[PDB]
Design a protein around this ligand. Structure first.
Ligand SMILES: [Mg+2]
Ligand SMILES: [Mg+2]
Ligand SMILES: [Mg+2]
Ligand SMILES: [Mg+2]
Ligand SMILES: [Mg+2]
Ligand SMILES: [Mg+2]
Ligand SMILES: [Mg+2]
Ligand SMILES: [Mg+2]
Ligand SMILES: [Mg+2]
Ligand SMILES: [Mg+2]
Ligand SMILES: [Mg+2]
Ligand SMILES: [Mg+2]
Ligand SMILES: [Mg+2]
Ligand SMILES: [Mg+2]
Ligand SMILES: [Mg+2]
Ligand SMILES: [Mg+2]
Ligand SMILES: [Zn+2]
Lengths: 83, 177, 116, 66
RNA sequence: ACGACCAGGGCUACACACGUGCUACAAUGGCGCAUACAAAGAGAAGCGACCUCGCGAGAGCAAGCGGACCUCAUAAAGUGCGUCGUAGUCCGGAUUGGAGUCUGCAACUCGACUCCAUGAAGUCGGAAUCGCUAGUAAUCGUGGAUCAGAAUGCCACGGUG
RNA sequence: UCCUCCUAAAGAGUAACGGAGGAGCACGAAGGUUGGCUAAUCCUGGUCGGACAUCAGGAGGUUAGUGCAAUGGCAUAAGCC
C-alpha cells in the first residue's frame, strides 16, 4: 500500500465533485473513471458509478467502504463458469 | 448441599418476591439432573460404551445405566435391544454437589466459553444443554483418555413455565448470557 | 500445563509448548517468557505454579484462540458483506492476493475437479 | 444408594488461581489446583471486552491529519 | 479509417491438460551463538559509507567515488559448543487476516519487501522419462544485463567436490 | 389335508373351477408362579447425531403390542421386566 506520510490518494476532479455534491446536497450518481481513488468519510451516502472498462456500475458508499478504493467495488473480469 | 442451603434460604425468598406466589410450595425447585451419553458407535465395539460409562462414572460418582434401543431402525444399523447409550440420574445431595462443581469448575473450563442459551428450556422450565468435550471436567485425565466423548445435561425442575426456571437458574447465577 | 483454556504438553520446552497456543509464535513466546522472567530451555515441567500464573497473565495480555478466531471471522465477513474483490475471492474460493488461477491455485481450490 | 458398584466419592479441596478455596465432593481423590474459577472467569468483563469491532472512519481519521 | 489522440479496462481470467523451473518431505538436518576462506562484476538523474532512529523492511543527516583508491558488500555451505530426538515434528513453508515501508501522478483489478499471527499438501513420488565421463555432476552462495519499481528466468563468477 | 374371514339369509350348519389370505412349526423358556410395570405416534429442548439411535418434558390414550395368517379377545392385562 501507500506510505502514511503521503497520506491517501484521490483525484482532484473527484474531490471537487464530492465537494459539489456535498454543498449542493444532490444525490445524483457521480460517474467516475477514478478506480484508484481512496474513499473518504465525506463520501458516505453517495452513489458513484465506477468505471470497469466497459460501463459505470453504481456503488452506494458505506461506512465500511471508507478505507478502500473505488476499484474494489467494480470488478473488471466477468466469470460465471465453464459448464 | 451447599447450594441446597443457598436455595432454601435465599432463592425461595427471592422468587416468592419476584412472582408473588401465594404459597411457598408454589416456588420452583430443582428435581433431577440427567446425564446422557448417546453412543451410537458402540455397535462397532463394546469397549467404547464400556469406557464412556467409566468416564461418566468419574464425573458423577454413580454407576451409569446403560440404555438400549427402544426399537430397531436400519438407517443407523441398529436392532431393538442393543446397548446404545448411557445415562445417570442425579437427585438429592449428589445432584446439588454436581451442580456446584458444574457451574463453578466445568463451565469455566469450556474452551471459548461465552455464555449459555436462554432458549433451551423446552417450553416448560426444563433446561437442556450439551457439552462438546468431557475434558472440561477435572475428574478426567487428559493423557489417560483417548477418545473425545460428549454428553448432554438435562435439568428437570418443577417450574411450570419457562421463565420460572430461567429465574431459578439465574438465582443460582447460571451463566446464561 | 493448561493456559488460556487449552492444555499444553509438558515434555516440550517452554517456547514451543507456548507456540501451541493459536495466536502466539516463537517471537511472541519469547516476549512472554521474557516478560515472565522464565528461561527458554526449561520445560513446562519443573515450573512453579506462580511462574505459570505469570505466564497466564502474560498470555492474557494478547488476543488468543476464541477472540482471535472471532476477529478473523469478522474481518472475512466484513469483506463478504461489502462485496469487494477480496470478498468475491473469499467466497469464490479463489486466491485473494492476486495469484494465478490458470495454474497452481490448489491451496484455495483443493484437489482437482475432473471434467465430467 | 447401593454399596459396591459406585466409585469413591470423597470430599477434597480445590483451590484456584484467584485463591478461591472450595471444598467439594469428587471422585478425584487427591487435592486439586485450578486455573480459572467461576469467580475469576472473564465472563462478566472479558467476554464483553472481547468483541472489539472498532471504527473504520475513526481508523481513517486516525491515520493522519489534513 | 484497417490511420491518429485520451481515460479506464485487458494481455495476470480458470471446471482443466502439458512443458520448464523453485522450495520441500529433514537428523549427511532444522535452531541459536561465535568464527574462517572467494572470484568476477556494476556505479553520476548513479553507487551510496560513518553516525543516529526503528524489532524490521527502511528513514534522516551525510563523506568518499566516473572509481586496482570509494561504494554496492558481512560470501554462504563450513568449522566450534549447546539444542531438538523421529513425531506431519523446533521438518515444510503454502494460504489467509492485521499492521507497515519503498518506488512511482498512481500499487483495487495488478508490485516487491518487512513485522506479528496463521501453519495446507507433502514422510522421496505410478506408467513413463532426463542430464552428466573431472574440477564434471551434485551442492553453496556472489554479481550483472533489462529496469523508477518489479525474477525461482537468463547471462556470468568463484567455494566444496 | 388343516386354519381364518366373507358368501351364510342376527342359534348351529350350509354349495360353486365363488372372493381374499395362511399352515405342514417354534419355545427347556417364548412354560408355571410371585412381585412390579403400561404402549403407538407426534411436539419442544438438547454434544457428536443426521427424516429417524439415546436423554428430559408435554399432548395423546392402545390408533401399540400378541413367535407366525386372519378373526375374536386382552388393563384384574392374555402385553412388558
Ligand atoms: Mg501458536
Ligand atoms: Mg491505455
Ligand atoms: Mg503473457
Ligand atoms: Mg521451520
Ligand atoms: Mg554452522
Ligand atoms: Mg544445534
Ligand atoms: Mg497426509
Ligand atoms: Mg517424517
Ligand atoms: Mg529494476
Ligand atoms: Mg541493473
Ligand atoms: Mg560453479
Ligand atoms: Mg350362522
Ligand atoms: Mg339364520
Ligand atoms: Mg407367551
Ligand atoms: Mg400381578
Ligand atoms: Mg433430535
Ligand atoms: Zn479462580
Amino acid at each position: 500500500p501507500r506510505s502514511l506520510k503521503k497520506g491517501p490518494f484521490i483525484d482532484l476532479h473527484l474531490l471537487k465533485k464530492v465537494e459539489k455534491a456535498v454543498e449542493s446536497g444532490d444525490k445524483k450518481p457521480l460517474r467516475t473513471w477514478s478506480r484508484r481513488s481512496t474513499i473518504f468519510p465525506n463520501m458516505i451516502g453517495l452513489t458513484i458509478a465506477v468505471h470497469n472498462g466497459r460501463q459505470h456500475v453504481p456503488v452506494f458508499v458505506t461506512d465500511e467502504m471508507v478505507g478502500h478504493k473505488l476499484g474494489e467495488f467494480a470488478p473488471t473480469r466477468t466469470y460465471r463458469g465453464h459448464a | 448441599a451447599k447450594l441446597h442451603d443457598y436455595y432454601k434460604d435465599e432463592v425461595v425468598k427471592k422468587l416468592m418476591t419476584e412472582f408473588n406466589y401465594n404459597s411457598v410450595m408454589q416456588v420452583p425447585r430443582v428435581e433431577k439432573i440427567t446425564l446422557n451419553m448417546g453412543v451410537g458407535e458402540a455397535i462397532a465395539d463394546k469397549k467404547l460404551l464400556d469406557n464412556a460409562a467409566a468416564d461418566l462414572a468419574a464425573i458423577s460418582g454413580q454407576k451409569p445405566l446403560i440404555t438400549k434401543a427402544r426399537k430397531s431402525v436400519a438407517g443407523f444399523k441398529i436392532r431393538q435391544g442393543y446397548p446404545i447409550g448411557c445415562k445417570v440420574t442425579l437427585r438429592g445431595e449428589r445432584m446439588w454437589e454436581f451442580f456446584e462443581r458444574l457451574i463453578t469448575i466445568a463451565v469455566p473450563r469450556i474452551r471459548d466459553f461465552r455464555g449459555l442459551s436462554a432458549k433451551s428450556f423446552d417450553g416448560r422450565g426444563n433446561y437442556s444443554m450439551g457439552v462438546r468435550e468431557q475434558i472440561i471436567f477435572p475428574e478426567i485425565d487428559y493423557d489417560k483418555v483417548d477418545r473425545v466423548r460428549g454428553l448432554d445435561i438435562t435439568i428437570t425442575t418443577t417450574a411450570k413455565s419457562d421463565e420460572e426456571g430461567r429465574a431459578l437458574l439465574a438465582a443460582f447465577d447460571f451463566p446464561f448470557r | 500445563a493448561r493456559i488460556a483454556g487449552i492444555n499444553i504438553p509438558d515434555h516440550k520446552h517452554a517456547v514451543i509448548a507456548l507456540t501451541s497456543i493459536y495466536g502466539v509464535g516463537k517471537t511472541r513466546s519469547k516476549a512472554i517468557l521474557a516478560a515472565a522472567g522464565i528461561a527458554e530451555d526449561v520445560k513446562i515441567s519443573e515450573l512453579s505454579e506462580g511462574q505459570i500464573d505469570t505466564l497466564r497473565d502474560e498470555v492474557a495480555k494478547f488476543v488468543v484462540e476464541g477472540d482471535l478466531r472471532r476477529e478473523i471471522s469478522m474481518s472475512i465477513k466484513r469483506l463478504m458483506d461489502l462485496g469487494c474483490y477480496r470478498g468475491l475471492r473469499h467466497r469464490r474460493g479463489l486466491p485473494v492476493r492476486g495469484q494465478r488461477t490458470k495454474t497452481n491455485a490448489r491451496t484455495r481450490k483443493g484437489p482437482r475437479k475432473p471434467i465430467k | 444408594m447401593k454399596k459396591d458398584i459406585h466409585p469413591k466419592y470423597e470430599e477434597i479441596t480445590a483451590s484456584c488461581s484467584c485463591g478461591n478455596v472450595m471444598k467439594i465432593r469428587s471422585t478425584v481423590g487427591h487435592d486439586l489446583n485450578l486455573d480459572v474459577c467461576s469467580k475469576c472467569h472473564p465472563f462478566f468483563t472479558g467476554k464483553q471486552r472481547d468483541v472489539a469491532t472498532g471504527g473504520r472512519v475513526d481508523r481513517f481519521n486516525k491515520r493522519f491529519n489534513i
